[PDB]
Design an enzyme around this catalytic site. Sequence first.
Site, short mmCIF file in Angstrom:
data_model
loop_
_atom_site.label_atom_id
_atom_site.label_comp_id
_atom_site.label_asym_id
_atom_site.label_seq_id
_atom_site.Cartn_x
_atom_site.Cartn_y
_atom_site.Cartn_z
N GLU A 15 30.49 42.10 44.13
CA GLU A 15 31.47 41.87 43.07
C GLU A 15 31.30 40.52 42.37
OE1 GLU A 15 34.88 42.99 45.83
OE2 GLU A 15 35.38 44.20 44.07
N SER A 161 35.41 47.20 44.54
CA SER A 161 34.93 47.75 43.27
C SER A 161 34.19 49.07 43.46
CB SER A 161 34.05 46.75 42.52
OG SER A 161 34.81 45.63 42.09
N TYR A 231 35.30 49.16 35.22
CA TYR A 231 34.97 47.97 34.45
C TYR A 231 34.34 48.23 33.10
CZ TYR A 231 35.83 46.11 39.09
OH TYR A 231 36.39 45.81 40.31
N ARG A 270 47.48 43.48 45.38
CA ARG A 270 47.62 44.77 44.72
C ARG A 270 47.48 45.85 45.78
NH1 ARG A 270 43.23 45.34 42.09
NH2 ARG A 270 42.48 47.23 43.15
N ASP A 272 47.24 49.80 46.67
CA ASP A 272 46.82 51.06 46.09
C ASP A 272 47.33 52.22 46.93
OD1 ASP A 272 45.48 49.10 44.75
OD2 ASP A 272 43.46 49.90 45.08
N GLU A 284 44.63 51.07 50.31
CA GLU A 284 44.17 49.77 50.76
C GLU A 284 45.12 48.71 50.21
OE1 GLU A 284 40.63 48.11 49.21
OE2 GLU A 284 40.98 48.77 47.14
N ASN A 286 44.51 44.82 48.40
CA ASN A 286 43.54 43.83 47.93
C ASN A 286 44.24 42.49 47.74
OD1 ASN A 286 41.05 45.71 47.21
ND2 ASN A 286 42.89 46.70 46.39
N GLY A 290 41.47 42.02 40.88
CA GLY A 290 40.76 41.61 39.69
C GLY A 290 41.71 41.14 38.59
#
Lengths: 326, 325
Positions: A15, A161, A231, A270, A272, A284, A286, A290
């Site tokens: 990443e 990612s 992305y 964040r 998910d 998960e 994070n 990002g």
Amino acid sequence: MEMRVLLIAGGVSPEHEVSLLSAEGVLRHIPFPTDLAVIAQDGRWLLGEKALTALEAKAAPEGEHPFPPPLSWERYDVVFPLLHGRFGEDGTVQGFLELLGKPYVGAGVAASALCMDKDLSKRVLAQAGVPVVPWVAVRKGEPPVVPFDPPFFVKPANTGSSVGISRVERFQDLEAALALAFRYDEKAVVEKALSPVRELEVGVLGNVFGEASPVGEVRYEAPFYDYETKYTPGRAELLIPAPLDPGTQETVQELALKAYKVLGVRGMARVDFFLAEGELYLNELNTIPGFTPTSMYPRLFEAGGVAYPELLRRLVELALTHHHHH
Amino acid sequence: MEMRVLLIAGGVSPEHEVSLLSAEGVLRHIPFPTDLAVIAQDGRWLLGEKALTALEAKAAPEGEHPFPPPLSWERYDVVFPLLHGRFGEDGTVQGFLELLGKPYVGAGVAASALCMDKDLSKRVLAQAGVPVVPWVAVRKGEPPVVPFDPPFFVKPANTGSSVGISRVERFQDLEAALALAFRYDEKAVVEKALSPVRELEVGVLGNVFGEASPVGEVRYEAPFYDYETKYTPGRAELLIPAPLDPGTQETVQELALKAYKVLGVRGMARVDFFLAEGELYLNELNTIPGFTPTSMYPRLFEAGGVAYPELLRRLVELALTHHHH
Ligand SMILES: Nc1ncnc2c1ncn2[C@@H]1O[C@H](COP(=O)(O)OP(=O)(O)OP(=O)(O)O)[C@@H](O)[C@H]1O
Ligand SMILES: Nc1ncnc2c1ncn2[C@@H]1O[C@H](COP(=O)(O)OP(=O)(O)OP(=O)(O)O)[C@@H](O)[C@H]1O
Ligand SMILES: [Cs+]
Ligand SMILES: [Cs+]
Ligand SMILES: [Cs+]
Ligand SMILES: [Cs+]
Ligand SMILES: [Mg+2]
Ligand SMILES: [Mg+2]
Ligand SMILES: [Mg+2]
Ligand SMILES: [Mg+2]
């Protein structure tokens, strides 16, 4: 403004470019004077104008200063580690900053290491009563033992990612998918594939009393939410708030704030989620989400009434209010 | 093959003095050329002769170089972190060595941080099917909720060498035991005390897939295996192999290697067990066990056929096997 923040982006993880993309998004909106330090893909550091130069290139293959860098750490009040993935989000950089004695944004050593490991985090979440997808851990060399039927999702245990992740249909394809994930980590997970599924994400902000953002949904037409879909601009459909009923959205936020406390996260996260047949599954968590133009975490809080500069300002303040409490 | 080891001992944790004793044991048996670096209690480092001088004093309150130290890391092939407790056994120092690129003895960042947290490790091990003592976590400032009857054992979540641990007989004494524990950590654990209890220990050597030592049993006449008992010579007896039922020794070793694999420990760990009313419980995994004169990890593997120099040789060797991967 006397506050001075050191932003660290790049890294040796896959990443690397995403991290540089996140640095550009944070540098555009942060309300404090901020210097950038870039970790090149070879592990060496870039400072000053050379770090800003690599930011324009959106990639830094080679660096100048070997670790530890000759950086004037006493110049900065807070360090912002924007390094996604291995050697940046898994506690390694956090441990270095703990020894420097600097306040830094985001989770500590144990919580960063725990959340980056897709196996150990699920074990903790399952023990606390949080719903997760059935899974099993496969070590390199060890043959796989999967007590459930395909389709699968094979991931490197410490990845981001969607790198190294494969959707597997037949047991014939498992060994090849495990071999891809083992290119990125000695350990991998095999998860039961939810089909069909809706993907929900919630941001969390805070140290002890974390507060959740509105629930958002991500939609796409690729096979799964992969690297190109995440992305490439316009490829992903970011729906905030998620077109759900309020009852499910409230339950999503309840689960996110609970996982935040169970895993010991501070600063930001964040979270998910998977929604399949009315059942919620935590995917998960994070700890360094990002901040790219297509990222979700900054948008999730703007919808909640927390503008981009206000979010970054509260991230820096939380790093100080945690440090003062030792 | 050239091999020069850098030994790091001392540290800011309460186990600072214990770490220097471990360094003296390691230096007395390690078969490689080994320099010592001492982390003083103030966080500053002592290098070279000042590190050896502080080793003779068995305590280093103040140091010279602030972190990071001007150490010639290129002179060494393996770093041996011998720092018991917080900021040494919990992944912080390991993260600095990872970014440094030098191979190092022992568990990585994740395995160190997880084994050093008495609440997080128990969460993982209980989910994996390892039997553990009933426990609860208490954050500093929050009121405790202990859903089981006393006696308790109150511990700092990051403690070692029985520092800050209290045996609580009455509920009116819980507050003082927590205030003691909170002197050393922002999180504390409250465990259901096993009374009576037998204490079993087994060493593990290897990367993820470990090799188990014979099971040893600790006996003592103190109220519990406390600090004075752990490091005063003669106060603790180690019975190897432990007087255990048939198959019970094997079950202890199976649980030890299973927890070792789940947590992904590399290098070494000492795995402690409780035996109470015929039932086994996993107490903790120590990734950097003591090498002090009264410590058990070298004695557990000596009984298993791995002498003190060979044990240290394999630890340095295992650090390179993982690094070369
Ligand atoms: N069990 C599953 N069922 C269905 N889809 C899945 C499953 N696991 C993963 N996926 C798909 O793969 C994508 C990547 O999963 P995951 O979130 O583990 O990757 P990641 O790299 O950790 O993501 P991030 O970039 O947020 O860190 C998900 O967005 C999802 O679309
Ligand atoms: N739940 C329990 N029931 C009975 N006795 C206990 C319990 N927990 C701890 N003890 C006693 O306290 C001692 C120290 O406990 P523990 O191993 O958690 O401390 P430690 O500081 O991690 O020790 P080490 O020096 O091995 O790191 C044990 O050897 C045992 O004698
Ligand atoms: Cs993660
Ligand atoms: Cs499982
Ligand atoms: Cs421990
Ligand atoms: Cs519990
Ligand atoms: Mg992720
Ligand atoms: Mg994801
Ligand atoms: Mg211990
Ligand atoms: Mg113990």
